[PDB]
């Protein structure tokens, strides 16, 4: 019935979009804000920010196609293809007004085409904790002076012959805990209950595969964004990144500067990759302030 | 016996600083030691060995923990494993210097021996891996061609037995996938050859030992930063595959910062597993390099 607890005042619902049944969680009143999660998680990573934004906004947090309780995409997993589903879902609830977009990890990959091709539909934009797919991702290190890299999963997930599925099947909880904790600075926030909920969700066979198909389409997304990036982004933009172990550090804003004309960036000390859960208070504060100012 | 011993060779053991090492020996004359790499054993040299034995005494040991060798008692860093390998070679050539041929992590486990005992090393052949130094931190996590060839560095080095946990029950699947994805000539890896390699490294202590070499890599980097203060002086050859899966120009490019007397070859259409993918041209280049002026 429900993989994750729905926050008070919110609603778990579905919408078919281009043949694909998307799951989403919606609440609040006012202009629309869409929150798009990343790999290893679902809409539920936003469950602490959602009631705060609901005080001024209509908040929708969908499950990415194939992840959570959304159906796999029927077109493909490249950024341009998935962005079609997400734009249509957001535009269905705010057809006359521009909306706000907050995105985390591969949520960036799956929305950037939508933003650059429909700038007038995007009022303000918040991107956190992942690169936009472009040639700069080819410079991430396979190995570092501190041991295992934070990005080796890019090639692991993208390997042919279903390597990752074959190796991870039957070990979904073990792998996800290793992936989450190795990208976290504050691992304390991931209780047994939270790790179980995420692991059970992405362990669904079609979800395990869908997770990696996003990475197998990464080269295709890079090529698409090389053409789309000819138009700079014009809406107000904020970037967030973890400054502790596991985060993007300075790279998040540095890359965004080549995309956005109007961008401010923050690096949150002692925080890793999973900002909404590791550093709920500072991150919620920065997002709420950015989207409230002048309104 | 895990792998068939070539006619005229013997499978034997020697104990070195408490660790019982396996090896295969044959021929007469000056000593050549052939050091294998990850995913394999001495047996990758079984085509070059009978050729070399016509002029040389050939010894191909199994790395500590791999094949039929016992795990090291000190550690898996380059300096630690080189002690076992240096003392083993000097047991068979205590009075004369010998030649060293090494492939993949065989380079990691012999370079400290070479730099500190140059008078013991007549000629040096290194193929298909970097010497552990800061350059390895520049390998790409992901490429314009898809999955990189080097991401296993971090996979193997991850904490909490990640690689062991995920590969357990899939040793043959993973090893076939790792080998073929690093090879240009996948046909030479028959069902029978893959089965022998998979059987060997699927031993619990061998699966772990395989990854411990990578878990010691940062320490090897720290060790080699000091050792490299002394350049290598003996004649040196490097070999690399120019096909999919190989080191390309980087093999010789890096060695130039280590050796004063080095020549390099990049073999077209060949991947990482030069002795098996491209036996004929590799064998010929090696035999010639160790035969000149002799």
């Amino acid at each position: 019935a429900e993989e994750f607890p729905v926050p008070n005042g919110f609603e778990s619902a579905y919408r078919e979009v281009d043949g694909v049944k998307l799951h989403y969680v919606k609440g609040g009143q006012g202009p629309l804000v869409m929150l798009v999660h990343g790999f290893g998680q679902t809409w539920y990573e936003w469950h602490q920010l959602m009631p705060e934004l609901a005080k001024r906004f209509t908040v929708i947090a969908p499950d990415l196609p194939g992840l959570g309780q959304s159906e796999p995409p029927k077109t493909g997993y490249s950024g341009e293809q998935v962005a079609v589903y997400l734009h249509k879902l957001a535009r269905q609830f705010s057809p006359d007004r521009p909306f706000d977009l907050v995105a985390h990890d591969i949520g960036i990959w799956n929305t950037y085409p939508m933003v650059v091709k429909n700038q007038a539909d995007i009022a303000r934009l918040v991107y956190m904790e992942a690169p936009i797919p472009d040639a700069r991702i080819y410079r991430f290190p396979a190995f570092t002076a501190q041991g295992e890299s934070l990005v080796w999963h890019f090639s692991f997930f993208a390997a042919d012959d279903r390597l990752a599925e074959t190796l991870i099947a039957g070990k979904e909880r073990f792998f996800l805990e290793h992936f989450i904790k190795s990208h976290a600075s504050n691992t304390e926030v991931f209780s047994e209950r939270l790790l179980d909920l995420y692991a059970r969700s992405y362990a669904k066979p079609h979800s395990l595969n869908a997770s990696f198909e996003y990475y197998r389409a990464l080269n295709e997304s890079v090529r698409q964004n090389a053409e789309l990036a000819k138009t700079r982004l014009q809406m107000p933009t904020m970037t967030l990144a973890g400054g502790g172990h596991g985060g993007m550090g300075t790279f998040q804003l540095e890359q965004m500067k080549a995309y956005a004309e109007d961008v401010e960036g923050h690096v949150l000390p002692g925080c890793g990759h999973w900002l909404p859960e590791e550093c709920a208070a500072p991150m919620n504060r920065l997002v709420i302030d950015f989207l409230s100012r002048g309104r | 016996e895990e792998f068939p011993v070539p006619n005229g060779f013997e499978s034997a053991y020697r104990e070195v600083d408490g660790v019982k090492l396996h090896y295969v020996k044959g021929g007469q004359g000056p000593l050549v030691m052939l050091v294998h790499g990850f995913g394999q054993t001495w047996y990758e040299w079984h085509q070059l060995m009978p050729e070399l034995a016509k002029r040389f005494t050939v010894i191909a040991p199994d790395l500590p923990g791999l094949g039929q060798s016992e795990p090291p008692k000190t550690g898996y860093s380059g300096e630690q494993v080189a002690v076992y390998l240096h003392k083993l070679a000097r047991q068979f050539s205590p009075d004369r210097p010998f030649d060293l041929v090494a492939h993949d992590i065989g380079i990691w486990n012999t370079y400290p021996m070479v730099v500190k005992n140059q008078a013991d090393i007549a000629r040096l052949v290194y193929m298909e891996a970097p010497i552990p130094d800061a350059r390895i931190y520049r390998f790409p996590a992901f490429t314009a061609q898809g999955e990189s060839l080097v991401w296993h560095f971090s996979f193997f080095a991850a904490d909490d037995r990640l690689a062991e946990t995920l590969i357990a029950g899939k040793e043959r699947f993973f090893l076939e996938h790792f080998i073929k994805s690093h090879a240009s000539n996948t046909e030479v890896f028959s069902e029978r050859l893959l089965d022998l390699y998979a059987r060997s490294y699927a031993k619990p202590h061998s699966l772990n030992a395989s990854f411990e070499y990578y878990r010691a890599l940062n320490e090897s980097v720290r060790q080699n930063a000091e050792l490299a203060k002394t350049r290598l002086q003996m004649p040196t050859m490097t070999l690399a595959g120019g096909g999919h899966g190989g080191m390309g120009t980087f093999q010789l490019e890096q060695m130039k910062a280590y050796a004063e007397d080095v020549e390099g070859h990049v073999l077209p259409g060949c991947g990482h597993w030069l002795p098996e993918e491209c036996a004929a041209p590799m064998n010929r280049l090696v035999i010639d390099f160790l035969s000149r002026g002799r």
């Epitope: - | 790409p140 096909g243 999919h244 190989g246 077209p268 060949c270």
Partner: nanobody, 120 residues
Framework: MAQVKLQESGGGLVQPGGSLRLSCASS????????MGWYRQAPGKQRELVAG???????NYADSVKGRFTISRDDAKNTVFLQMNSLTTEDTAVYYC?????????????WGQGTQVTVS
């Protein structure tokens, strides 16, 4: 040296609606090549990717040619083929064979000499 040499066959002049099959052979076994691809460049325009095929067998195509062009791999002939169906004047360009070989530090690009394709 050069780690691969590429030799194209095919091309020429064809009428709208017609077909052509391009060919690219590799000096090394084609399995040693990570990505085989076809690019095209018309005068005064940018070089663009048309089709690519990986060792796995996965193919990818440009939007303007999806459904009309087909890239395929003949391991015995060490050859990659580009079947070009339903040609329009908008497909007129010089078509280049492309080989990408991945090494540990990264890939190396190799290009063929190119063949002229004119649709008129």
């Amino acid at each position: 040296m050069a780690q691969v040499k590429l030799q194209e066959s095919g091309g020429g002049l064809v009428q709208p609606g017609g077909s052509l099959r391009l060919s690219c052979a590799s000096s090394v076994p084609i399995f040693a090549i990570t990505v085989m691809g076809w690019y095209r460049q018309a005068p005064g325009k940018q070089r663009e990717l048309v089709a690519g095929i990986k060792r796995s067998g996965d193919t990818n195509y440009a939007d303007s040619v999806k459904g009309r062009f087909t890239i395929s791999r003949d391991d015995a002939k060490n050859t990659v083929f580009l079947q070009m169906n339903s040609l329009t004047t908008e497909d007129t360009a010089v078509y280049y064979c492309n080989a990408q070989i991945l090494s540990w530090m990264g890939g190396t690009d190799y290009w063929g000499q190119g063949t002229q394709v004119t649709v008129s």
